[PDB]
Structure formats: structure tokens, C-alpha cells
Structure 1
Amino acid sequence: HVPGGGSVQIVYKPVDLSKVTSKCGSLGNIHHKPGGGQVEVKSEKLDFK
């Protein structure tokens, strides 16, 4: 007679991470509009015919 059993195997799945996006707001915007254009407002026309 061969005496019974004496054999198991481990309940084991290794852990890892997939498709974890680096979605931080650290560079979250790029858009700009200038603070108006350059103009002259200080001078008269002096249009005395």
C-alpha cells in the first residue's frame, strides 16, 4: 500500500498594476490670449487747416 495524499500547492497570484494613467493636473492647461495690443493715445492731430 501507498499511504494517502501529502501534496498541496500554493494559493498565489502575484500583484501588479496595469493602465494606471498619470492623470495629475501638473501640466493641465496650455492656452493663452495677449493682454491687449499696443496703441498710441497721448497725441493730438493738430489739424488746423
Structure 2
Amino acid sequence: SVQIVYKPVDLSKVTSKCGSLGNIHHKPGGGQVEVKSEKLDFKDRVQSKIGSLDNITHVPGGGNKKIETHKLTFR
């Protein structure tokens, strides 16, 4: 016969302390953007993005990550 005991344990801690957070600035695309196009031929699919796109400012007062996995397998 076979007997299996599986009891792993976690009690872990993650933390931050800050006296103050501030005076934070992000200014993507401050300059002029220009595009000019003539006589182009396209014979297959086209995708275009122009200007100030997808820019992120991300200022979490704290932000932390855990990942865990368990896979007990018989045959």
C-alpha cells in the first residue's frame, strides 16, 4: 500500500512604511508630433498608432506580489 502526508506551511509577511509620498510628475509626449504620407500602396493588412498612447503612471502607496503552486500526482 501507499500513504502520503502533505502539510506545507507559510506564515510570511511583506510591508512598507513611508513618512510622506508626493511631488511626482510624468509628462510623456511634451513635444510636437508630425506625419506626412504620399502615394503609398498596401496589398495586405495595415495597423497604425500616432501620438501619445498607452503611457502609465503607477504610484501604489504599497504594492507586492506572491505566487504559490502544489501538484500532487499519482498513477
Report the TM-score range of the alignment, normalised by the length of the smaller protein: under 0.3
TM-score after normalising by structure 2: 0.16
Q: Which has the higher helix share?
A: 1
1:27–1:14 CA distance, 2 compared to 1 (3 A): farther
Q: Which runs of 4+ in 1 moved over 2 A?
A: 7-28, 36-40, 45-49
1:45–1:13 CA distance, 2 compared to 1 (3 A): closer
Deviations, residues 2-44 of structure 1 (Å, cap 9, x unaligned): xxxxx99999999999999999999941230302798662122
Q: Which has the higher strand share?
A: 2
Q: Find 1:19's aligned residue among 1, 13, 29.
A: 13
| Number of positions where the alignment pairs a residue of Structure 1 with one of Structure 2 | 43
Mapped partners of 2:13, 2:41: distance in 1: 72
Mapped partners of 2:39, 2:12: distance in 1: 70
Structure 1 segments unaligned to the other structure (5+ residues): 1-6
TM-score after normalising by structure 1: 0.19
1:47–1:25 CA distance, 2 compared to 1 (3 A): same
1:22–1:13 CA distance, 2 compared to 1 (3 A): farther
